Amino acid sequence: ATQGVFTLPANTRFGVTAFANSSGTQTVNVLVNNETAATFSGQSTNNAVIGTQVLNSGSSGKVQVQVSVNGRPSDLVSAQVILTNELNFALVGSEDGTDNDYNDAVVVINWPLG
Amino acid sequence: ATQGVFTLPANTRFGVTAFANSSGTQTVNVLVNNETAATFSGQSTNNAVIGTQVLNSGSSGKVQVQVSVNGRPSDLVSAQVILTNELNFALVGSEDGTDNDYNDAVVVINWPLG
Amino acid sequence: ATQGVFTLPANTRFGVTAFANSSGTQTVNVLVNNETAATFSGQSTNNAVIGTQVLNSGSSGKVQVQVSVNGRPSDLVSAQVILTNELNFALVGSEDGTDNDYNDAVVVINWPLG
Amino acid sequence: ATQGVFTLPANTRFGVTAFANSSGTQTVNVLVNNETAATFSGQSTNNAVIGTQVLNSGSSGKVQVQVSVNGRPSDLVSAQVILTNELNFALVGSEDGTDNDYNDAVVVINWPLG
Ligand SMILES: [Ca+2]
Ligand SMILES: [Ca+2]
Ligand SMILES: [Ca+2]
Ligand SMILES: [Ca+2]
Ligand SMILES: [Ca+2]
Ligand SMILES: [Ca+2]
Ligand SMILES: [Ca+2]
Ligand SMILES: [Ca+2]
Numbered sequence: 001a002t003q004g005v006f007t008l009p010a011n012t013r014f015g016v017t018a019f020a021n022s023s024g025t026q027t028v029n030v031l032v033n034n035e036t037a038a039t040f041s042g043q044s045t046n047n048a049v050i051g052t053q054v055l056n057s058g059s060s061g062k063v064q065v066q067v068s069v070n071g072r073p074s075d076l077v078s079a080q081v082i083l084t085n086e087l088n089f090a091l092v093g094s095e096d097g098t099d100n101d102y103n104d105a106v107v108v109i110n111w112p113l114g
Numbered sequence: 115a116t117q118g119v120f121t122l123p124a125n126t127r128f129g130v131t132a133f134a135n136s137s138g139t140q141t142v143n144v145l146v147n148n149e150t151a152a153t154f155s156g157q158s159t160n161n162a163v164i165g166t167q168v169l170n171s172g173s174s175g176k177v178q179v180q181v182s183v184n185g186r187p188s189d190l191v192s193a194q195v196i197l198t199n200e201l202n203f204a205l206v207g208s209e210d211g212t213d214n215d216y217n218d219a220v221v222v223i224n225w226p227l228g
Numbered sequence: 229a230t231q232g233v234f235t236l237p238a239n240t241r242f243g244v245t246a247f248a249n250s251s252g253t254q255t256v257n258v259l260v261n262n263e264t265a266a267t268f269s270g271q272s273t274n275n276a277v278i279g280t281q282v283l284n285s286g287s288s289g290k291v292q293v294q295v296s297v298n299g300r301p302s303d304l305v306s307a308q309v310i311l312t313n314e315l316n317f318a319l320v321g322s323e324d325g326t327d328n329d330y331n332d333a334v335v336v337i338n339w340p341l342g
Numbered sequence: 343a344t345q346g347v348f349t350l351p352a353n354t355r356f357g358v359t360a361f362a363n364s365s366g367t368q369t370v371n372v373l374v375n376n377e378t379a380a381t382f383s384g385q386s387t388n389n390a391v392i393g394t395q396v397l398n399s400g401s402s403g404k405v406q407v408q409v410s411v412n413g414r415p416s417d418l419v420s421a422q423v424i425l426t427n428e429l430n431f432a433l434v435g436s437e438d439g440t441d442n443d444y445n446d447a448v449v450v451i452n453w454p455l456g
Contacts, residue, residue: 001312001419001437001444003343015161019129021227047129047227052163077197077343079421082308083207084191084229087216093201095343101226102201102343108222112215113135113161115231115305115323115330115426191229193307194424198343209229216229243361243389249455275357275455277394305426311419311435315444321429329454330429336450340443341363341389 003076004065006090006109008057014090014111016065017052020044022104024069024096030107031064032057050105054113067105069096077102088112117190118179120204120223122171128225130179131166134158136218138183138210144221147174164219168227181219183210191216202226231304232293234318234337236285242318242339244293245280248272250332252297252324258335259292260285278333282341295322295333305330316340345418346407348432348451350399356432356453358407359394362386364446366411366438372449373406374399389448396455409447411438419444430454 008014018028018040030038032055040051057063067074074094081089090109093102122128132142132154144152146169154165171177181188188208195203204223207216236242246256246268258266260283268279285291295302302322310316318337321330350356360370360382372380374397382393399405409416416436423431432451435444 001345001417001435001442003312005313007313015133017131017133017163019131019224045228047127047166047168047224049131049163049166052161054161075343077201078312079195079197080310080313081193081195081203081205081423082310083193083205084214084216084231084306085233085235085308086214087191087207087220089195089203089205089222091195091197091203093197100198100200100343101228102198103224103226103228106201106224108131108203108224110133110161110217110220110222112217114159114215114217115303115321115328117229117426119427121427189229192426194427195309196422196424198345198420199347199349199422207229214229245359245361245391245450247357247359247452273456275394275396275452277359277391280361280389280391282389305429307423307425309421309423309433311421311433312442312444314442315419315435315448317423317431317433317450319423319425319431321425328426328428329456330426331452331454331456334429334452336431336452338361338389338445338448338450340445342387342443342445 003078004092006063008061008063010059010061012057012111013054013113014109015054016109018050019047019106020050021047022096026105027068028105029066033060065092065107067094117192118206120177122175122177124173124175126171127227128223129168130223132164133161133220134164135161136210140219141182142219143180145178147172147176179206179221181208231306232320234291236289236291238287238289240285241282241341242337243282244337246278247275247334248278249275250324254333255296256333257294261288293320293335297324345420346434348405350403350405352403354399355396355455356451357396358451360392361389361448362392363389368447369410370447371408375402407434407449409436
């Protein structure tokens with residue numbers, strides 16, 4: 001099943017933050033309405049934040065996270081969680097190799113902001 | 115129900131990151147085995163990542179997130195989600211006012227790291 | 229924070245199922261548009277399905293779950309999770325006593341159906 | 343990533359319930375310790391419970407859900423959610439066709455029971 005794709009409410013600001021846990025350099029691309037709106041790159045085996053940004057979901061509200069490591073897309077796992085029917089988390093884990101810890105690049109999308 | 119309390123596997127590194135979205139100055143305290151292990155604070159209505167740190171769950175694996183704003187504990191909401199039976203996110207939202215967006219201080223705990 | 233309240237898409241069919249795990253007889257009320265649309269009662273310490281129905285979210289999409297034992301409201305905990313940006317689960321747990329297992333009445337709402 | 347596989351606490355009772363939403367007859371196999379522990383079969387386009395049972399996670403605590411329609415394995419999506427650090431839901435969605443509503447066979451695993 002498709003992972004890393006989320007439908008947010010339209011024209012809504014949301015935060016996107018990426019963490020790295022891998023010997024491999026992580027490149028995280030955040031697409032909004034099918035266009036790259038943010039790119040974070042970094043290498044850490046210590047959950048370092050390799051990037052954070054606030055984006056607008058645009059008219060489509062379509063947000064997609066892609067993670068690439070050593071020239072190959074990482075396998076993605078994701079889910080959206082909603083707390084108290086108001087607070088949203090779009091979560092992404094990714095696996096760049098074979099140990100399947102899926103934390104190589106961890107991406108958290110959260111909204112609403114403000 | 116109690117919120118903001120999570121049982122992690124013992125002696126396990128986890129990341130804890132806080133985001134602020136409120137005119138109110140947020141103060142986030144992270145307790146491990148009931149002892150403060152990290153404290154973050156900030157004032158942003160634009161999802162500033164006011165703090166991130168790597169902690170160890172210790173022998174108890176007990177982790178608790180507390181949030182206060184100008185001397186008042188905020189109301190918390192939380193849940194834990196596990197993806198592909200490997201990646202864990204312990205999520206916390208908090209409300210310091212009356213609009214109930216519960217994003218005033220948002221805390222994300224993730225493990226495993228590395 | 230308010231729990232057991234979910235905003236589903238309007239006029240959408242959804243399933244609501246309740247399980248009991250308590251010495252006490254559970255009463256589960258499912259409210260749509262603030263009106264009781266389904267009610268289940270029963271006692272089991274073996275996860276019996278005391279009720280499962282398909283209801284339509286109506287024009288507002290507002291769905292609320294209430295759990296009480298012989299008239300005494302139980303404490304609720306809830307969250308919503310969406311898988312592959314399509315499959316929705318609204319989850320409710322409830323505590324009617326002191327042990328805090330919050331499984332006295334467990335309610336799961338899922339959509340889309342069909 | 344693998345889906346439908348969950349690690350429950352060892353030797354713990356849990357409930358597993360399957361709902362069907364498809365013209366195809368759904369077969370859900372629940373394995374514990376990699377051995378079939380339960381199997382449900384039914385057809386419904388109205389979220390009917392095609393099976394519900396209480397099982398024990400056994401020594402490994404490993405529980406896997408597999409879904410097949412017409413002898414073909416459905417694609418699965420899943421996640422585990424924990425509320426108030428006590429109540430667990432291991433959720434599974436499955437797709438037997440091309441519309442990708444992933445609700446053809448929905449399986450809900452919950453614990454603790456009692
Ligand atoms: Ca890895
Ligand atoms: Ca890793
Ligand atoms: Ca607020
Ligand atoms: Ca706010
Ligand atoms: Ca109880
Ligand atoms: Ca109970
Ligand atoms: Ca389908
Ligand atoms: Ca279907």
